[PDB]
Coordinates of C-alpha atoms in Angstrom, one line a residue:
Chain W
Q3 CA 0.0 0.0 0.0
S4 CA 1.1 3.6 -0.6
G5 CA 0.2 7.1 0.8
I6 CA -1.9 8.1 -2.3
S7 CA -5.7 8.1 -1.9
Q8 CA -7.6 6.1 -4.7
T9 CA -10.9 6.9 -6.4
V10 CA -13.2 5.0 -8.8
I11 CA -12.5 6.2 -12.4
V12 CA -14.9 5.4 -15.3
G13 CA -13.8 5.9 -19.0
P14 CA -12.2 6.6 -21.3
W15 CA -14.8 7.6 -23.9
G16 CA -13.3 8.6 -27.2
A17 CA -10.0 7.5 -28.9
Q18 CA -8.3 4.2 -27.8
Chain V
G1 CA -2.9 14.9 -28.2
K2 CA -1.6 16.2 -24.7
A3 CA -3.0 14.1 -21.8
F4 CA -4.3 15.8 -18.7
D5 CA -5.4 14.7 -15.3
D6 CA -7.0 17.1 -12.9
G7 CA -7.3 14.4 -10.1
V8 CA -10.0 14.2 -7.4
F9 CA -11.9 17.0 -5.6
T10 CA -15.0 17.5 -3.3
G11 CA -17.4 18.4 -6.1
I12 CA -18.0 20.6 -9.2
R13 CA -18.9 24.3 -9.3
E14 CA -18.5 25.2 -13.1
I15 CA -17.6 23.6 -16.4
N16 CA -16.0 25.9 -19.1
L17 CA -15.8 24.2 -22.5
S18 CA -15.6 25.2 -26.2
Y19 CA -17.1 23.5 -29.2
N20 CA -17.5 23.8 -32.9
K21 CA -20.9 22.9 -34.5
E22 CA -19.0 21.3 -37.5
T23 CA -16.2 19.4 -35.8
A24 CA -16.0 18.5 -32.0
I25 CA -15.3 19.6 -28.5
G26 CA -12.2 21.9 -28.1
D27 CA -11.1 23.4 -24.7
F28 CA -12.2 21.8 -21.4
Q29 CA -11.8 23.3 -17.9
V30 CA -13.5 22.7 -14.5
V31 CA -13.9 24.9 -11.4
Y32 CA -14.0 22.3 -8.7
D33 CA -15.2 22.5 -5.1
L34 CA -12.4 21.8 -2.7
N35 CA -13.7 21.5 0.9
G36 CA -16.2 24.3 0.6
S37 CA -14.0 26.7 -1.5
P38 CA -13.6 27.1 -5.4
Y39 CA -10.6 25.4 -6.9
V40 CA -9.9 26.6 -10.4
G41 CA -8.8 23.7 -12.6
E42 CA -6.3 24.2 -15.4
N43 CA -7.8 25.1 -18.7
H44 CA -7.0 22.2 -21.1
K45 CA -6.7 23.8 -24.5
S46 CA -7.0 22.8 -28.1
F47 CA -4.0 23.4 -30.3
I48 CA -6.3 25.2 -32.8
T49 CA -8.8 28.1 -32.6
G50 CA -12.3 28.9 -33.9
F51 CA -14.4 27.3 -31.1
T52 CA -17.4 28.8 -29.3
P53 CA -17.1 29.0 -25.5
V54 CA -19.9 27.9 -23.0
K55 CA -20.0 28.4 -19.3
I56 CA -22.0 25.8 -17.3
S57 CA -22.4 27.4 -13.9
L58 CA -23.8 24.9 -11.4
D59 CA -25.8 26.1 -8.3
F60 CA -23.3 24.2 -6.0
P61 CA -24.0 22.3 -3.7
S62 CA -27.7 21.9 -4.3
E63 CA -27.2 21.2 -8.1
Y64 CA -25.0 18.4 -9.3
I65 CA -24.5 16.3 -12.5
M66 CA -26.6 13.1 -12.7
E67 CA -25.8 12.1 -16.3
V68 CA -23.0 12.9 -18.8
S69 CA -23.7 11.9 -22.4
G70 CA -22.3 12.6 -25.8
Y71 CA -21.0 11.2 -29.1
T72 CA -17.7 10.0 -30.3
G73 CA -16.7 9.9 -34.0
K74 CA -14.1 10.5 -36.6
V75 CA -12.9 14.1 -37.4
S76 CA -10.1 14.4 -40.0
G77 CA -9.1 10.8 -39.4
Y78 CA -9.1 11.0 -35.5
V79 CA -11.6 9.4 -33.1
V80 CA -12.7 12.4 -30.9
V81 CA -15.4 13.5 -28.5
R82 CA -17.8 15.2 -30.9
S83 CA -20.5 16.3 -28.5
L84 CA -21.3 16.5 -24.8
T85 CA -24.4 17.0 -22.7
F86 CA -24.5 17.5 -18.9
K87 CA -27.8 16.7 -17.1
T88 CA -28.1 17.8 -13.5
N89 CA -30.9 17.4 -10.9
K90 CA -32.0 21.0 -12.0
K91 CA -31.6 21.2 -15.8
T92 CA -29.9 20.0 -19.0
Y93 CA -26.8 21.7 -20.4
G94 CA -26.3 20.9 -24.1
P95 CA -25.8 19.1 -26.5
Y96 CA -22.7 21.1 -27.4
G97 CA -20.9 20.2 -30.6
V98 CA -22.0 17.7 -33.3
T99 CA -24.5 14.9 -32.3
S100 CA -23.0 12.4 -34.8
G101 CA -21.2 9.1 -34.5
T102 CA -21.4 6.7 -31.6
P103 CA -23.4 7.7 -28.5
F104 CA -22.3 7.2 -24.9
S105 CA -24.1 7.9 -21.6
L106 CA -23.1 7.7 -18.0
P107 CA -26.2 8.1 -15.7
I108 CA -25.4 8.1 -12.0
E109 CA -28.0 6.5 -9.5
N110 CA -25.8 7.1 -6.5
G111 CA -22.6 9.1 -6.2
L112 CA -20.9 12.2 -7.7
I113 CA -18.4 13.2 -10.4
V114 CA -15.4 14.7 -8.5
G115 CA -12.7 15.0 -11.3
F116 CA -11.8 14.7 -15.0
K117 CA -8.9 13.4 -17.0
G118 CA -8.4 13.0 -20.7
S119 CA -6.5 14.2 -23.7
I120 CA -6.8 17.2 -26.2
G121 CA -5.1 17.7 -29.5
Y122 CA -7.0 19.7 -32.1
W123 CA -10.1 18.3 -30.3
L124 CA -11.0 16.5 -27.0
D125 CA -9.6 13.0 -27.9
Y126 CA -11.0 11.2 -24.9
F127 CA -12.0 11.7 -21.3
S128 CA -12.6 9.8 -18.0
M129 CA -14.4 10.8 -14.8
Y130 CA -13.5 10.2 -11.1
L131 CA -16.6 9.1 -9.1
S132 CA -17.1 9.2 -5.3
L133 CA -19.8 9.0 -2.7
Chain J
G1 CA -41.1 -6.5 -15.5
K2 CA -40.0 -7.8 -12.1
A3 CA -37.4 -5.5 -10.5
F4 CA -34.3 -7.1 -8.9
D5 CA -31.4 -5.8 -6.9
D6 CA -28.6 -8.2 -5.9
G7 CA -26.8 -5.5 -3.8
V8 CA -23.1 -5.2 -3.3
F9 CA -20.4 -7.9 -2.8
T10 CA -16.6 -8.3 -2.8
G11 CA -16.2 -9.1 -6.5
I12 CA -17.5 -11.2 -9.4
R13 CA -16.8 -14.9 -10.0
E14 CA -19.3 -15.9 -12.8
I15 CA -22.0 -14.4 -15.0
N16 CA -24.7 -16.6 -16.4
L17 CA -27.0 -15.0 -19.1
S18 CA -29.0 -16.0 -22.1
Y19 CA -30.0 -14.3 -25.4
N20 CA -31.9 -14.6 -28.6
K21 CA -30.6 -12.8 -31.7
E22 CA -34.2 -11.8 -32.8
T23 CA -35.0 -10.4 -29.4
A24 CA -32.8 -9.6 -26.4
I25 CA -31.2 -10.8 -23.1
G26 CA -33.4 -13.4 -21.4
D27 CA -31.7 -14.4 -18.2
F28 CA -29.2 -12.8 -15.8
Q29 CA -27.6 -14.5 -12.8
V30 CA -24.3 -13.7 -11.1
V31 CA -22.0 -15.8 -8.8
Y32 CA -20.3 -13.1 -6.6
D33 CA -17.4 -13.3 -4.3
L34 CA -18.4 -12.7 -0.7
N35 CA -15.2 -12.4 1.4
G36 CA -13.6 -15.3 -0.4
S37 CA -16.6 -17.6 -0.8
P38 CA -18.9 -17.8 -3.9
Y39 CA -22.3 -16.3 -3.3
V40 CA -24.9 -17.5 -5.8
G41 CA -27.1 -14.6 -6.7
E42 CA -30.8 -15.1 -7.4
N43 CA -31.6 -16.2 -11.0
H44 CA -33.4 -13.3 -12.8
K45 CA -35.1 -15.2 -15.5
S46 CA -37.4 -14.4 -18.5
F47 CA -41.1 -15.1 -18.3
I48 CA -40.5 -17.0 -21.7
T49 CA -38.2 -19.6 -23.4
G50 CA -36.0 -20.3 -26.6
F51 CA -32.8 -18.4 -25.4
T52 CA -29.1 -19.4 -26.0
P53 CA -27.4 -19.9 -22.6
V54 CA -24.0 -18.4 -21.8
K55 CA -21.7 -19.0 -18.8
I56 CA -18.8 -16.5 -18.2
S57 CA -16.4 -18.0 -15.7
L58 CA -13.8 -15.6 -14.5
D59 CA -10.3 -16.4 -13.2
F60 CA -11.1 -14.6 -9.9
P61 CA -9.3 -12.7 -8.3
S62 CA -6.7 -12.1 -11.1
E63 CA -9.3 -11.7 -13.8
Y64 CA -11.9 -8.9 -13.5
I65 CA -14.3 -6.9 -15.7
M66 CA -12.7 -3.7 -17.2
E67 CA -15.7 -2.8 -19.5
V68 CA -19.4 -3.6 -19.9
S69 CA -20.9 -2.6 -23.2
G70 CA -24.0 -3.5 -25.1
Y71 CA -27.0 -2.2 -27.1
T72 CA -30.5 -1.2 -26.2
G73 CA -33.5 -1.3 -28.6
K74 CA -37.2 -1.8 -29.0
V75 CA -38.4 -5.4 -29.0
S76 CA -42.1 -6.1 -29.3
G77 CA -42.8 -2.5 -28.2
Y78 CA -40.5 -2.5 -25.1
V79 CA -37.1 -0.8 -24.8
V80 CA -34.7 -3.6 -23.6
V81 CA -31.1 -4.6 -23.4
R82 CA -30.5 -6.5 -26.7
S83 CA -26.8 -7.4 -26.4
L84 CA -24.0 -7.5 -23.8
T85 CA -20.2 -7.7 -24.0
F86 CA -17.9 -8.1 -20.9
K87 CA -14.2 -7.3 -21.4
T88 CA -11.8 -8.4 -18.8
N89 CA -8.0 -7.9 -18.4
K90 CA -7.7 -11.4 -19.9
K91 CA -10.2 -11.4 -22.9
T92 CA -13.5 -10.2 -24.4
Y93 CA -16.7 -12.3 -23.6
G94 CA -19.3 -11.6 -26.3
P95 CA -21.1 -9.9 -27.9
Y96 CA -24.1 -12.0 -26.7
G97 CA -27.0 -10.7 -28.8
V98 CA -27.0 -8.6 -31.9
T99 CA -24.9 -5.4 -32.0
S100 CA -27.8 -3.2 -33.1
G101 CA -29.7 -0.3 -31.6
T102 CA -28.3 2.3 -29.3
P103 CA -24.9 1.4 -27.9
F104 CA -23.8 2.0 -24.3
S105 CA -20.3 1.5 -22.8
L106 CA -19.0 1.5 -19.3
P107 CA -15.2 1.2 -19.3
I108 CA -13.5 1.2 -15.9
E109 CA -10.0 2.7 -15.4
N110 CA -9.9 2.2 -11.6
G111 CA -12.3 0.2 -9.4
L112 CA -14.5 -2.8 -9.8
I113 CA -18.1 -3.8 -10.5
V114 CA -19.4 -5.4 -7.2
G115 CA -23.1 -5.8 -7.9
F116 CA -26.0 -5.6 -10.4
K117 CA -29.6 -4.4 -10.2
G118 CA -32.3 -4.1 -12.9
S119 CA -35.6 -5.5 -14.2
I120 CA -36.6 -8.5 -16.2
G121 CA -40.0 -9.1 -17.9
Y122 CA -39.9 -11.1 -21.2
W123 CA -36.3 -9.6 -21.5
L124 CA -33.8 -7.6 -19.5
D125 CA -35.6 -4.2 -19.3
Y126 CA -32.7 -2.3 -17.8
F127 CA -29.7 -2.7 -15.4
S128 CA -27.4 -0.7 -13.2
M129 CA -24.0 -1.6 -11.7
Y130 CA -22.5 -1.0 -8.2
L131 CA -18.9 0.2 -8.4
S132 CA -16.3 0.2 -5.6
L133 CA -12.6 0.2 -4.9
Chain U
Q3 CA -27.9 8.5 8.5
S4 CA -28.9 4.8 8.4
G5 CA -27.2 1.6 9.3
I6 CA -27.0 0.5 5.6
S7 CA -23.6 0.9 3.8
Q8 CA -23.7 2.7 0.4
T9 CA -21.9 2.3 -2.8
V10 CA -21.5 4.3 -6.1
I11 CA -24.2 3.0 -8.6
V12 CA -24.1 3.8 -12.4
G13 CA -27.0 3.3 -14.8
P14 CA -29.6 2.4 -15.6
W15 CA -29.1 1.5 -19.2
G16 CA -32.4 0.2 -21.0
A17 CA -36.0 1.2 -20.4
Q18 CA -36.3 4.7 -18.8
Chain I
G1 CA -4.8 -17.8 19.0
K2 CA -6.9 -18.8 15.9
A3 CA -7.1 -15.9 13.5
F4 CA -10.6 -15.0 12.1
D5 CA -11.7 -12.6 9.4
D6 CA -15.4 -12.2 8.6
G7 CA -14.8 -9.7 5.8
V8 CA -17.2 -6.8 4.9
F9 CA -21.0 -6.7 4.7
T10 CA -23.7 -4.0 4.5
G11 CA -24.3 -3.5 8.2
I12 CA -24.7 -5.2 11.6
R13 CA -27.9 -6.8 13.0
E14 CA -26.7 -8.6 16.2
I15 CA -23.5 -9.3 18.1
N16 CA -23.1 -12.4 20.2
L17 CA -20.2 -12.4 22.6
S18 CA -19.1 -14.0 25.9
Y19 CA -17.0 -12.7 28.8
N20 CA -15.6 -13.7 32.2
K21 CA -15.5 -11.2 35.1
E22 CA -12.1 -12.5 36.2
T23 CA -10.4 -12.6 32.8
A24 CA -11.5 -11.2 29.4
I25 CA -13.8 -11.5 26.3
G26 CA -14.1 -15.1 25.1
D27 CA -16.4 -15.9 22.1
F28 CA -17.4 -13.5 19.4
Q29 CA -20.0 -13.9 16.6
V30 CA -21.9 -11.4 14.4
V31 CA -25.2 -11.6 12.5
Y32 CA -24.5 -9.1 9.6
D33 CA -26.8 -7.5 7.2
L34 CA -26.1 -8.5 3.6
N35 CA -28.1 -6.3 1.2
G36 CA -31.3 -6.2 3.4
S37 CA -31.2 -9.8 4.6
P38 CA -29.5 -11.3 7.8
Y39 CA -26.2 -13.2 7.2
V40 CA -25.1 -15.3 10.1
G41 CA -21.3 -15.0 10.6
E42 CA -19.3 -17.9 12.0
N43 CA -19.0 -18.3 15.7
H44 CA -15.4 -17.6 16.7
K45 CA -14.9 -19.6 19.9
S46 CA -12.5 -19.5 22.9
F47 CA -10.4 -22.7 23.4
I48 CA -12.0 -22.9 26.9
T49 CA -15.5 -22.8 28.5
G50 CA -16.8 -20.8 31.6
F51 CA -17.8 -17.6 29.9
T52 CA -21.1 -15.6 30.3
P53 CA -22.9 -15.1 26.9
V54 CA -24.6 -11.8 25.8
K55 CA -26.8 -11.0 22.9
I56 CA -26.8 -7.4 21.5
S57 CA -29.8 -7.3 19.1
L58 CA -29.8 -4.1 17.1
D59 CA -33.0 -2.5 15.6
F60 CA -31.4 -2.5 12.1
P61 CA -31.3 -0.2 10.1
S62 CA -32.6 2.7 12.3
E63 CA -30.1 1.6 15.1
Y64 CA -26.4 1.4 14.3
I65 CA -23.0 1.5 16.2
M66 CA -21.5 5.0 16.7
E67 CA -18.6 4.0 19.1
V68 CA -16.7 0.8 20.1
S69 CA -14.6 1.1 23.3
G70 CA -12.9 -1.2 25.7
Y71 CA -9.8 -2.2 27.6
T72 CA -6.7 -4.3 26.7
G73 CA -4.5 -5.8 29.3
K74 CA -2.5 -8.7 30.5
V75 CA -4.3 -12.0 31.4
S76 CA -1.9 -14.9 32.5
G77 CA 1.0 -13.0 30.7
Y78 CA -0.9 -12.4 27.4
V79 CA -2.1 -9.1 26.1
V80 CA -5.9 -9.5 25.4
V81 CA -9.1 -7.5 24.9
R82 CA -10.4 -7.5 28.4
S83 CA -13.7 -5.6 27.9
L84 CA -15.9 -4.2 25.2
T85 CA -18.7 -1.6 25.0
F86 CA -20.9 -0.9 21.9
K87 CA -22.6 2.4 21.8
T88 CA -25.4 3.0 19.3
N89 CA -27.5 6.0 18.4
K90 CA -30.1 4.6 20.7
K91 CA -28.3 2.9 23.7
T92 CA -25.0 1.8 25.3
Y93 CA -24.4 -2.0 25.4
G94 CA -21.8 -2.8 28.1
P95 CA -19.2 -2.8 29.5
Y96 CA -18.8 -6.6 29.1
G97 CA -15.8 -8.2 30.7
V98 CA -13.0 -6.6 32.9
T99 CA -12.6 -2.8 32.6
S100 CA -8.9 -2.9 33.7
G101 CA -5.7 -2.1 31.8
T102 CA -5.4 0.4 28.9
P103 CA -8.6 2.0 27.4
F104 CA -9.2 2.3 23.7
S105 CA -12.1 4.2 22.0
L106 CA -13.3 4.3 18.3
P107 CA -16.0 6.9 17.9
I108 CA -17.4 7.2 14.4
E109 CA -18.4 10.6 13.2
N110 CA -19.3 9.5 9.7
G111 CA -19.6 5.9 8.4
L112 CA -20.4 2.4 9.7
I113 CA -18.8 -0.7 11.0
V114 CA -19.4 -3.4 8.4
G115 CA -17.1 -6.3 9.5
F116 CA -14.8 -7.7 12.2
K117 CA -11.5 -9.6 12.2
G118 CA -9.2 -10.7 14.9
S119 CA -7.8 -13.7 16.8
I120 CA -9.1 -15.8 19.7
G121 CA -7.1 -18.2 21.9
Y122 CA -8.4 -18.7 25.5
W123 CA -9.5 -15.1 25.0
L124 CA -10.0 -12.4 22.3
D125 CA -6.3 -11.5 21.6
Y126 CA -6.9 -8.6 19.2
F127 CA -9.5 -7.3 16.8
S128 CA -10.0 -4.9 13.9
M129 CA -13.0 -3.4 12.2
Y130 CA -13.9 -2.7 8.6
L131 CA -15.4 0.8 8.1
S132 CA -17.4 2.0 5.1
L133 CA -19.8 4.8 4.1
Chain H
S4 CA -26.0 17.3 -2.0
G5 CA -23.1 17.8 -4.5
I6 CA -20.6 17.5 -1.6
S7 CA -18.4 14.3 -1.6
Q8 CA -18.3 12.4 1.7
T9 CA -15.6 10.4 3.6
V10 CA -15.4 8.2 6.7
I11 CA -14.6 10.3 9.8
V12 CA -13.3 8.8 13.1
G13 CA -13.4 10.8 16.3
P14 CA -13.6 13.1 18.1
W15 CA -10.9 12.5 20.7
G16 CA -10.6 15.1 23.5
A17 CA -13.4 17.4 24.9
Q18 CA -17.1 16.2 24.5
Chain Z
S4 CA -7.0 -7.2 -8.3
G5 CA -10.6 -8.3 -8.5
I6 CA -11.1 -8.0 -4.7
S7 CA -13.0 -5.0 -3.3
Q8 CA -11.1 -3.0 -0.6
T9 CA -12.4 -1.4 2.6
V10 CA -10.9 0.9 5.3
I11 CA -9.8 -1.3 8.3
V12 CA -9.0 0.2 11.7
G13 CA -7.1 -1.7 14.3
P14 CA -5.8 -4.0 15.6
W15 CA -6.5 -3.3 19.3
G16 CA -5.1 -5.9 21.7
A17 CA -2.0 -8.2 21.3
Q18 CA 0.7 -8.3 18.5
Chain M
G1 CA -12.5 27.2 21.2
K2 CA -12.4 28.0 17.5
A3 CA -13.6 25.1 15.4
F4 CA -11.7 24.1 12.3
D5 CA -12.3 21.7 9.4
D6 CA -9.6 21.2 6.7
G7 CA -11.7 18.7 4.9
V8 CA -10.3 15.8 2.7
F9 CA -7.2 15.6 0.5
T10 CA -5.1 12.9 -1.3
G11 CA -2.6 12.3 1.5
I12 CA -0.3 14.0 4.1
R13 CA 3.1 15.6 3.4
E14 CA 3.8 17.4 6.7
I15 CA 2.3 18.1 10.1
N16 CA 3.4 21.3 12.0
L17 CA 2.3 21.4 15.6
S18 CA 3.3 23.0 18.9
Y19 CA 3.2 21.7 22.5
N20 CA 4.1 22.8 26.0
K21 CA 5.5 20.1 28.4
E22 CA 3.4 21.5 31.3
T23 CA 0.0 21.9 29.5
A24 CA -1.0 20.5 26.1
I25 CA -0.9 20.7 22.3
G26 CA -1.3 24.2 21.0
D27 CA -0.9 24.9 17.2
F28 CA -1.9 22.4 14.5
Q29 CA -1.3 22.8 10.7
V30 CA -1.0 20.3 7.9
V31 CA 0.6 20.3 4.5
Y32 CA -1.5 17.9 2.5
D33 CA -1.0 16.3 -0.8
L34 CA -3.6 17.3 -3.4
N35 CA -3.4 15.3 -6.6
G36 CA 0.4 15.1 -6.5
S37 CA 1.3 18.6 -5.4
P38 CA 1.4 20.1 -1.9
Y39 CA -1.6 22.0 -0.4
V40 CA -0.8 24.1 2.6
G41 CA -3.6 23.8 5.2
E42 CA -4.7 26.8 7.3
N43 CA -2.6 27.3 10.5
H44 CA -4.9 26.6 13.4
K45 CA -3.4 28.6 16.2
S46 CA -3.7 28.7 20.0
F47 CA -5.0 31.9 21.6
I48 CA -2.0 31.6 24.0
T49 CA 1.8 31.8 23.4
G50 CA 4.8 29.9 24.8
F51 CA 4.6 26.6 22.9
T52 CA 7.5 24.5 21.4
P53 CA 7.2 23.9 17.6
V54 CA 7.7 20.6 15.8
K55 CA 7.8 19.7 12.1
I56 CA 6.8 16.2 11.1
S57 CA 8.0 16.0 7.5
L58 CA 6.9 12.8 5.8
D59 CA 8.4 11.0 2.8
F60 CA 5.2 11.2 0.9
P61 CA 3.8 8.9 -0.7
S62 CA 5.9 5.8 0.4
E63 CA 5.8 7.0 4.0
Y64 CA 2.3 7.2 5.5
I65 CA 0.8 7.3 9.0
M66 CA -0.2 3.9 10.4
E67 CA -1.2 5.0 13.9
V68 CA -2.1 8.2 15.7
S69 CA -2.1 7.9 19.5
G70 CA -2.0 10.3 22.5
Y71 CA -3.5 11.4 25.7
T72 CA -6.5 13.5 26.7
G73 CA -6.7 15.2 30.1
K74 CA -7.7 18.2 32.1
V75 CA -5.8 21.6 31.8
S76 CA -7.3 24.6 33.8
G77 CA -10.7 22.8 33.9
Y78 CA -10.8 22.1 30.1
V79 CA -10.6 18.6 28.6
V80 CA -7.9 18.8 25.9
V81 CA -5.5 16.8 23.8
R82 CA -2.3 16.8 26.0
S83 CA 0.0 14.6 23.8
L84 CA 0.3 13.2 20.3
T85 CA 2.4 10.5 18.6
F86 CA 2.4 9.7 14.9
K87 CA 3.7 6.3 13.9
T88 CA 4.4 5.7 10.2
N89 CA 5.6 2.6 8.3
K90 CA 9.2 4.1 8.5
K91 CA 9.5 6.0 11.8
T92 CA 7.8 7.1 15.1
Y93 CA 7.3 10.9 15.7
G94 CA 6.7 11.7 19.3
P95 CA 5.4 11.7 21.9
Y96 CA 4.9 15.5 21.8
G97 CA 3.4 17.1 24.9
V98 CA 2.5 15.5 28.2
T99 CA 1.9 11.8 28.4
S100 CA -0.7 12.0 31.2
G101 CA -4.4 11.5 31.3
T102 CA -6.4 8.9 29.4
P103 CA -4.8 7.3 26.3
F104 CA -6.3 6.9 22.9
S105 CA -5.1 5.0 19.9
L106 CA -6.1 4.9 16.2
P107 CA -4.1 2.2 14.3
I108 CA -4.9 1.8 10.6
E109 CA -4.7 -1.7 9.0
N110 CA -6.0 -0.5 5.5
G111 CA -6.6 3.0 4.4
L112 CA -5.1 6.5 4.9
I113 CA -5.7 9.6 7.0
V114 CA -6.7 12.3 4.4
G115 CA -7.8 15.2 6.6
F116 CA -8.2 16.7 10.1
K117 CA -10.9 18.7 11.9
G118 CA -11.3 19.8 15.5
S119 CA -11.1 22.9 17.7
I120 CA -8.4 25.0 19.3
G121 CA -8.9 27.5 22.2
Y122 CA -5.9 28.0 24.4
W123 CA -5.1 24.3 23.5
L124 CA -6.2 21.6 21.0
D125 CA -9.7 20.8 22.5
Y126 CA -10.6 17.8 20.3
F127 CA -9.9 16.4 16.8
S128 CA -11.2 13.9 14.3
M129 CA -9.7 12.3 11.2
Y130 CA -11.0 11.7 7.7
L131 CA -10.1 8.2 6.4
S132 CA -10.1 7.0 2.9
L133 CA -8.7 4.3 0.6

């Protein structure tokens, strides 16, 4: 574990 | 394009974007809430001009986004975000841009959008959203 | 249709579904992970028959869904989920059902799907997903 | 404030 | 001691524990809520008998734990959890056990206890709690 | 509201 | 991984 | 005392506090991480002078707090935070202040402290911590 808070991320929409 | 990543905040106060009714979304910027005070996000800019600016000023914190929808499609050989619509619990902002190509929609039953990341070249190439309770 | 809500769990182990190319999704059942043990969700089944069965067995915990996409459309006067595709970090499961109608896509950059809710009548009317870290 | 834990929920997709 | 880990659920319905007025907490077991239905957790038992059992039946979901407190201390040369108190928004349950040694207190300003883990030998050696919104 | 929430533990001290 | 995470406080007691 | 609430951030880079070996904790200020860059929190100052300052500079993000402990007790008829200790995965900082009164301990097994709130009059009256994954 590290000291950086995590968050849910949805996407990407668009290229790739 | 140039990737960007605003990170995560406490909420959204304003979205400032630009679009062209013949191509796609250009500039993208967000004024976030950060623990009860405005936090001015960086303005992520297109490498070209000729866009029309819009200011989406939310009545924070009583008004918040409940659905983000839009279209993706090819512009000059590139897959980009052609249109965006923001639906809040109070009103609908948009569509901005060109409603052509493949649609997408992110309705939220529970939770909030708290950040944006993506990439912009001549147009908004792609984007993602941070979600939190 | 009959609404359902499985609620939220620790992860996903298996997805059972069924479809018919002329119509839509006709069954939806999930085996969740609940703190290390499989938890068999209730079988949300169509009021009718003639569907093609599908079992998606995931290599939990290393393998997990990174995108859910599909299509909605009118079938016999009802707006329903006609097709589903589940992309994991290992492979793509689907499409199951025709790739026609209005597309939708939920890619996940960070976090996991931990539950499903929705409604089923003759077909899967609608669905939502619980997301968590 | 209830005794029931909550989670982010996205959707619905389909009949609305 | 024998380590245990119930994992995470959606809330708490009942706590069944046992104690001895000369030593410490013995047995520990929880009936959790799992998406609106009771889920009976495994009984985590002391290696020995002679404890006094207690049932803490909560009026779920209107009643929930707001603070867990207690004492840790030496019993026959072992550091163990000597007493526990569960305070809800409606009532204080406890203290159960021996209120001697070093106090500890976990007040919750926002969120809920959704799971327990720990280790039990002759007595409850240690414990941890899962917290969620 | 449109305000994000987080788990909060405490307070420790007065009250 | 495919395993949902949760905040955990503790342990209180031994170790 | 004067209530304060810094709110939630991405992590902790530095804690600047003051203490007096005959009374309690005075000043409290935090440099947070906000999406990869420092965010200097408001300095929450005591109404009284004569405190000894201390800087707890953390090796963010690989170094993070795993336990906050201390003592609460009476000073001039006020219940205040008399001592604080911060234990990280790399070092122990403290105790700062007077180790007298009633102990408290917040060990973290999974998750992070991402913010602080409380109140300061002549001394740190009380405090709470925001926790997140």
